[PDB]
Amino acid sequence: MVGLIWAQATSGVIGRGGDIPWRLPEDQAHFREITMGHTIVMGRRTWDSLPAKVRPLPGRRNVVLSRQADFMASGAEVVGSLEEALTSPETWVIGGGQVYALALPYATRCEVTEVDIGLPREAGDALAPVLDETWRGETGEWRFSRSGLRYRLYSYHRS
């Protein structure tokens, strides 16, 4: 199984300037819960976005997708292709915008956190993948983050 997990503003932005313009501590815990014990596949720019203190993310097989044959990610696996990374029972693609789109054909689950931040789309932003007709969503309650933004969980499944 391959899943995608991302947080987006209502507009669809997931990243800007190489990072995320919000931090919901409740979303950080949900990500650990859903990913713990499994393979996380991330692009090179998102691995760069991980603080060196926290990477690799513990309890998980960190796989970094890159076109650089010399790029090294200490404590992670660097592979040049996405399915070179899909050899475990359950795989989660943890970003970013480029790898979400590259992994969407392989994906049957999208765990999406919608952050009620009014953030207009702008050039150079990373955007969430477009989910087509095949995706069925189940929606959760609007909840309050301690960071002051509303959020809610969207679970997308497809056969």
Ligand X SMILES: Cc1ccc2[nH]cc(CCCOc3c(C(=O)O)cnn3-c3ccccc3)c2c1
Residues in binding site for NADP(+): 19, 44-46, 66-68, 96-99
Query: Which of the 8 DSSP states describes residue 18?
Result: T
Window contacting ligand X (CB under 6 A); options: 45-53, 71-79, 101-109, 128-136: 45-53
109-146 exposure pattern, b = at least 16 Cβ within 10 A, e = fewer: bbbbbbbebebeeeeebbbbbebeeebeeeeeeeeebe
Annotated binding site: 7, 14, 19, 44-46, 66-68, 96-99
Q: Which does 111 bind (CB under 5 to 8 A by kind): ligand NDP, ligand X, none?
A: none
As measured in angstroms, the least distance from the Cβ of 38 to ligand X is 11
As measured in angstroms, the least distance from the Cβ of 37 to ligand NDP is 19
By CB under 6 A, is residue 95 in contact with ligand X?
A: yes
Among 6, 59, 57, smallest CA distance to 36 is for 59
- How far apart are alpha carbons 38 and 41 in whole angstroms? 10
